Design a protein around this nucleic acid. Structure first.
Ligand code: CA
Ligand code: CA
Length: 338
DNA sequence: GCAGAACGTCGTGAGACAGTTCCG
DNA sequence: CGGAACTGTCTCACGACGTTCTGC
């Protein structure tokens, strides 16, 4: 079972980003009495091309659960179903989990009560409540609230499985301090819900080269989960910009400029997976930018790194960035290189 | 002259299941 | 009977910026 602290932390970061912890009950037209089995799962979702990364997480989790290279729409998932695997896996992830920690504790709890709850409609209903919380915790505010417990209490009374009086508790409307696991999580989360990117900004008032290469990493999330960004922000020495809302209900945390990324990135690189290349390329740009400012020749092949980064932030089929082709044209016609 | 902050935004890349097929 | 695997998708929650807006 011995899964490494920074491997557990990364996965939790990644799960909190691109994963899902959830509970559901399945109709079972062949079960003894209670015709529902409560299903429990965690999953990791990602685009087809990044499958090796899922396959890697799989291998770390003792090769439990079922991988899927393609689920139909060029997109891949790794679902771990059942209490056998989850009672081994979740204990390892729960300490590092943040956004979905509650969901994980709930699943872990359902596991504890399931044996007894299994052939007792009273204790099954009480457990179905926990299935409700989990599905609710995965919901928005404005969304319809989970009514599995209500629909089953009605089903149990009609099927004569429960006598008076019924339960219960349901809404019945009838300097650094960035340590290994701190960085590992953040890298997990950035790999999931984050972005590492470079861009050319047109600056209509520069000495010679009228562009500046802008460098950034960002974190994106729904506004309700903003405090979690506010956490990562604090943990990174309080660098960069935060938005509680950018206008469309989704928050972001953006760290622009070599100054911050010279400090932050080296902390995340060793734990970064999906976005590690982008990270190093940014560091590389930071590394050879001083000399690149004056010389249009050194600016150009540095502008290639920008293209390369933007390329990495695309699938193979997308049209590849042409900043190098456009600036080469511009520099020739401005006589800056000939 | 320099560069970060803030604003706004296509076009997908996810989340979180519900069903349904296998399976000892 | 018991429950996990595999199929399939609807609805946003993201990404990765182009823009432009301050700030010394
Ligand atoms: Ca997410
Ligand atoms: Ca992602």
């Amino acid at each position: 079972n011995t899964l490494q602290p920074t491997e557990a932390a990364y996965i939790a970061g990644f799960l909190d980003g691109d994963g899902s912890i959830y509970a559901k009950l399945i109709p079972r037209p062949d079960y003894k009495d209670i015709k529902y089995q409560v299903s429990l799962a965690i999953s990791f979702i990602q685009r087809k091309d990044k499958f090796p990364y899922l396959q890697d997480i799989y291998d770390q989790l003792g090769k439990r659960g079922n991988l899927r290279k393609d689920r139909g729409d060029g997109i891949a998932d790794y679902t771990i179903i059942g209490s056998t695997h989850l009672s081994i896996i979740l204990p390892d992830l729960v300490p590092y989990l943040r956004i979905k920690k509650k969901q994980a504790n709930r699943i872990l709890h359902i596991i504890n009560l399931y044996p007894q709850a299994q052939k007792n409609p009273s204790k099954f209903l009480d457990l179905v409540k926990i299935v409700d919380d989990v599905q609710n915790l995965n919901k928005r505010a404005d969304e319809l609230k989970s009514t599995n417990y209500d629909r089953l209490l009605e089903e149990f009374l009609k099927a004569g499985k429960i006598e008076s009086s019924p339960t219960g508790s349901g809404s019945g409307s009838k300097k650094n301090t960035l340590q290994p696991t701190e960085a590992a999580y953040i890298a997990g989360f950035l790999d999931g819900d984050g972005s590492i990117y470079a861009k050319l900004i047109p600056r209509p008032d520069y000495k010679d080269i009228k562009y500046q290469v802008s460098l950034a990493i960002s974190f994106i999330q729904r506004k309700d989960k903003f405090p979690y960004l506010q956490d990562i922000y604090d943990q990174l020495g309080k660098r960069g910009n935060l938005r509680k809302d950018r206008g469309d209900g989704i928050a972001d945390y953006t760290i622009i400029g070599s100054t911050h990324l010279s400090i932050i990135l080296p902390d995340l690189v060793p734990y970064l997976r999906i976005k590690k290349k982008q990270a190093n390329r940014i560091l590389h740009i930071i590394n050879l930018y001083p000399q690149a400012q004056k010389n249009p020749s050194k600016f150009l092949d540095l502008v290639k790194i920008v293209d390369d980064v933007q390329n990495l932030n695309k699938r193979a089929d997308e049209l590849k960035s042409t900043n190098y082709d456009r600036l080469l044209e511009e520099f020739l016609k401005a006589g800056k290189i000939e």
